[PDB]
Nucleic acid binder design. Structure first.
Lengths: 159, 57, 192, 63, 185, 51, 171
RNA sequence: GCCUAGACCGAGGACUGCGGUUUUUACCUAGGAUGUUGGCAUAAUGAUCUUAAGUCGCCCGUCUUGAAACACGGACCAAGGA
RNA sequence: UUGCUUAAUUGAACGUGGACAAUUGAAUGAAGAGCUUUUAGUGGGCCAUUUUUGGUAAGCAGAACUGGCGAUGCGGGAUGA
RNA sequence: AGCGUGCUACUUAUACUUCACCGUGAUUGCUGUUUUGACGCUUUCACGAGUAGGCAGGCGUGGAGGUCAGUGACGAAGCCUU
């Protein structure tokens, strides 16, 4: 019949990477997690304690609690027509800092740095990001790059 | 049956001031005094006649 | 008007000079596009349907101006099988705004019959006349977003002369949907 | 005799999107349920002394 | 054919007139309809809406709540505005001298307000001495202290009150309310 | 109460666009362009013919 | 269709590694410039590692006929897809313009092989200058000296529905 | 920019506005039709009923994924009837 | 501030005070957002594209996503959910 | 008047554009001119499919309170009727 156990369907997700089995490098145990930090959840198969459920493998959340060897992570899950607040206890082996903030945090510093320079210079500076615009006009020099005429080639069997 | 009410007034409102100032009629270029015309309607339909004057009517 | 004439003559002179000096002038990619929804409201998948709702195209023969970027290009790409879009000329924009131009005033569709209507809603953006609005649309300006969202989506009529034999195929393949890049003007003249 | 439709998810996303899907409301102070008692025990004393310090500073400014 | 982004012909969902057929309430609505239309005072629009509220949405404002409001910093001489009934509170030790405009006063509340040197006026008199709501302070009664609100949102792990007729050891206390009888929710 | 097309009604056009009158006076829509008579494609651009 | 011959020139987008990419030209027979640029990319991606996103269109120009009022014989090399496989044919056409021989070819492959415009690639359109360069007999018969032929059985189209006189087919 | 042919409509009802011409505290094509002419008022016109012609139209109610069904109830009428 | 933590005057959490104003930090849109109570019917479904399982196959049986019919008239497919 | 392909014109949906009218929702304004309807009038814009079902506004029947100092043997009620 049907089987719907805890680790059903986790044959490949919970596998260690190729040529990456064995013990955990200790930079994992040295990272410092604070409440409010944003962490990516990726279950490590070699540690079976504090292992997340298969739904949370690949999810990103908010650290809300710090314990002896684990952190509490907040995940929003769609259940029907609304989101339900979930609180998962995860050992730090299954938790990594999300890199989305460190990119945005630098932009906060850069925007502050650029705004004081313009204020010091008394001008106005625009800090909104802009999508890729259509390219402008340009002149193509043919000196050394005279166009070569291409044509579709005849059909041919190569086997 | 519902009886009429006091607020149901009876006066006829004045018409709004229209902007229909008339302009002179334009005739066809082929209509020139002396031209022989053919009548298409009326008692004298089918008759050939002589055009003399453009009346202001 | 003077700067329109100067820009046109400058582009022509640049092309001629490039032709003279053994070069090739590559024209600047258009910044503005006009998008007309040519497909009805029935049997639309949810993602293109949401895209069309975000473009304010909720009926057939509805037109809208879009400033081309990566985000807007990827938006229009999803709605391509249901819209015909292209690069509008100055005269096409002027005819559209003059004949079928309506503003969104307090969530109401108000005809742009006087400059007071345009000023009362766009004076904080330095738009004082219908020509200011047309200039802001044609040359994509700093206040393009506010001016374009002020305009109610244009409600065009069916083309005089019809479409091609079959609409709902790409313009390259003999249909009407997709990008036609200068023929949007002929379509609008048929349609406006 | 009654072999019927066992299960389908058809039409379920339509019903999920009539009134949803609603993201949860975010507040400035999330609830401290599930937080370690040892932290939560000390946090009670830290807040208590903190308000006392602010009260005495404000009390001097009035008299 | 229109692709509707919203439900069509949806009513505002708010009261635009009192459900009551009281002729004298319609006179107060008449007065504050003119005021909310001709004054641009935000006080006038708020009073007009509160005149439309139902009975459960106009809880009584006790004379202690007004006393607490009169004890705010600089609000001692303000005109307390209560769109509803003002009830007595025999738990007070004293009530200050103040003017209170209310839809209704109970016999005990009016007796105490006048005895302390205050004034108990109706809302029409408020418009004569404060057509723009100058120096006023609107006070509202507690809405969620109602007994019906106790049972709203009842469910497992909610902490609300079950809808029940009798209270005792034999009425909904054994299984699901106690781990000695299975589980507790 | 009635929308009027400025592309048909001249008074409405002059109301919305005061410059239109000037556009008529100088005949800007039929403006002659003064320029030299040159053939700038006589050189490598004749590469259009064959390559 | 009603076609035109276009010069389309494109190149890969300039890169810091490659700041002057090679310019590529093709001759495209398309009804308009929108199909012209579309067909141009369709052939570069069959021959080069480039895309419309990673490339750039540099020039689109109409190549007008050099002698639109001179009778010429064009030999066309094709590559079309049938219901079974892919075949190469060479066919010849008589016309005054280069586009007109291509237009005839598209009508001819539709009529004789049920080959649609999407199924046909034009490898080369060549003017046959010499009479010896002509290989197909269905066009050599019009290269004979002092060619004369009547048009027997002329059919006259009538404006009226009924004709009071007996018909004739002389010409 | 100019000339030119046809069709459909006339909502509103003192004034107010935006413009233009300004020969002008005036006029206009500029916030929605007026002028004039004939005929009739035993009638031209409009409506309904019956009928003819053209075109479309399967027998309602019901359970049902699906009814005109070769699925079930219904000959008709009056009163009662949930 | 703490009774947590540190060898510590270290940190953790929460704060006092001060600086950075509409480009307050991507696009587009928004008949506005949020909240609550209460109650109806329903809980036989079916079809089309595409992915797919059993089956020789089936107008067969079973699933995935979307769109429809049911609950829907109108123009086309002569006729047809 | 078949098949493949191209073009020009033409035909018409309860679809699109403009206009009229009906209703719904929102919206503008209205008391020294509120002026015997403010549960009213007024401006503007948008929208209009629908079984099960919900709600709102109305029509009709037997009796009851009040009022029309209501109709009526000089003809009530009922019934038939292009």
């Amino acid at each position: 019949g049907k089987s719907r156990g805890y680790r059903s369907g986790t044959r490949y997700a919970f596998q260690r990477d190729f040529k990456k089995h064995g013990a955990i490098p200790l930079s994992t145990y040295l990272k410092v997690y604070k409440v409010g930090d944003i962490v990516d959840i990726k279950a490590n198969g070699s540690i079976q304690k504090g292992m997340p459920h298969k739904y949370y493998h690949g999810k990103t959340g908010i650290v809300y609690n710090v314990t002896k060897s684990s952190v509490g992570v907040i995940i929003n899950k769609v259940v029907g027509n609304r989101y339900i607040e979930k609180r998962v206890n995860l050992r730090v082996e299954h938790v990594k800092h999300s890199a989305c903030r460190q990119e945005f945090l630098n932009r906060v510093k850069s925007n502050a740095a650029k705004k004081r320079e313009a204020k010091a210079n008394g001008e106005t500076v625009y800090l909104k990001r802009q999508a890729a615009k259509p390219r402008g006009s340009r002149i193509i020099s043919t000196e050394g790059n005279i166009p070569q005429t291409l044509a579709p080639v005849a059909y041919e069997t190569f086997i | 049956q519902v009886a009429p009410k006091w607020y149901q007034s009876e006066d006829v409102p004045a018409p709004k001031q229209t902007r229909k100032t008339a302009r002179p009629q334009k005739l066809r270029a082929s209509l020139v005094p002396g031209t022989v015309l053919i009548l298409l309607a009326g008692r004298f339909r089918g008759k050939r006649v002589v055009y003399l004057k453009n009346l202001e009517d | 008007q003077k700067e329109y004439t100067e820009a046109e003559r400058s582009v022509i002179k640049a092309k001629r000079d490039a032709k003279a000096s053994n070069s090739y002038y590559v024209d600047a990619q258009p910044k503005l596009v006009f998008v007309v929804r040519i497909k009805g409201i029935n049997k639309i998948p949810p993602k293109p349907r949401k895209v069309l709702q975000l473009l304010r195209l909720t009926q057939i023969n509805a037109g809208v101006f879009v400033r081309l970027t990566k985000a807007t290009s990827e938006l229009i790409k999803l709605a391509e099988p249901y819209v015909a879009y292209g690069y509008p000329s100055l005269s096409t924009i002027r005819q559209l705004v003059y004949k079928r131009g309506f503003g969104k005033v307090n969530k109401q569709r108000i005809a742009l019959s006087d400059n007071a209507i345009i000023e009362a809603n766009l004076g904080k953006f330095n738009i004082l006349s219908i020509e200011d609005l047309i200039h802001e649309i044609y040359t994509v300006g700093p206040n393009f977003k506010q001016v374009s969202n002020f305009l109610w989506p244009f409600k065009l009529s069916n083309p005089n002369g019809g479409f091609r034999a079959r609409k709902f195929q790409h313009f390259i393949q003999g249909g009407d949907t997709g990008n036609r890049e200068q023929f949007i003007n002929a379509l609008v003249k048929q349609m406006n | 005799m009654a072999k019927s439709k066992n299960h389908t998810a058809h039409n379920q996303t339509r019903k999920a999107h009539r009134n949803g899907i609603k993201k949860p409301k975010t507040y400035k102070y999330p609830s401290l349920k599930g937080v370690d008692a040892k932290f939560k025990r000390n946090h009670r004393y830290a807040l208590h002394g903190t308000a006392k310090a602010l009260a005495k500073a404000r009390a001097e400014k009035s008299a | 054919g229109r692709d509707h982004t919203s439900k069509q012909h949806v009513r505002s969902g708010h009261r635009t007139a009192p459900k009551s057929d009281n002729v004298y309430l319609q006179l107060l609505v008449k007065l504050y309809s003119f005021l909310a239309r001709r004054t641009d005072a935000p006080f006038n629009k708020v009073i007009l809406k509160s005149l439309f509220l139902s009975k459960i949405n106009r809880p009584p404002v006790s004379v202690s709540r007004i006393s607490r409001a009169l004890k705010q910093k600089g609000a001692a001489e303000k005109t307390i505005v209560v769109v509803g009934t003002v009830t007595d509170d025999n738990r007070l030790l004293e009530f200050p001298k103040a003017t209170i405009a209310a839809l209704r006063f109970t016999a005990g509340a009016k007796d105490r307000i006048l005895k302390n040197g205050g004034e108990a006026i109706t809302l029409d008199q408020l418009a004569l001495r404060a057509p723009k709501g100058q120096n006023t302070l609107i006070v509202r009664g507690p809405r969620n202290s109602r007994e019906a609100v106790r049972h709203f949102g009842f469910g497992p792990h909610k902490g609300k009150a079950p809808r029940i007729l009798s209270k005792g050891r034999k009425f909904e206390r054994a299984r699901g309310r106690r781990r000695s009888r299975g589980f507790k929710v | 109460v009635l929308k009027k097309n400025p592309l048909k009604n001249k008074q409405v056009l002059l109301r919305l666009n005061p410059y239109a009158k000037a556009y008529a006076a100088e005949k800007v829509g039929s403006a002659k362009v003064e320029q030299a008579k040159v053939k700038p494609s006589k050189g490598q651009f004749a590469e259009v013919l064959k390559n | 269709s009603r076609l035109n011959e276009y010069q389309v020139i494109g190149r890969n987008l300039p890169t810091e590694s490659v700041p002057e990419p090679k310019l590529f030209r093709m001759r495209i027979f398309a009804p308009n410039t929108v199909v012209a640029k579309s067909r141009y990319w369709y052939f570069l991606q069959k021959l080069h590692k480039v895309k419309k996103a990673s490339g750039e269109i540099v020039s689109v120009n109409i190549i007008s006929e050099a002698k639109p009022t001179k009778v010429k014989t064009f030999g066309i090399w094709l590559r079309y897809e049938s219901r079974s496989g892919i075949h190469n044919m060479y066919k010849e056409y008589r016309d005054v313009t280069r586009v007109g021989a291509v237009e005839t070819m598209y009508q001819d492959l539709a009529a004789r092989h049920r080959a649609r415009f999407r199924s046909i690639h034009i490898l080369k359109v060549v003017e046959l200058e010499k009479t010896d360069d002509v290989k197909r007999q269905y066009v050599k018969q019009f290269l004979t000296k002092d060619l004369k032929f009547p048009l027997p059985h002329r059919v006259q189209k009538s404006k009226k529905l009924f004709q009071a006189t007996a018909p004739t087919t002389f010409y």
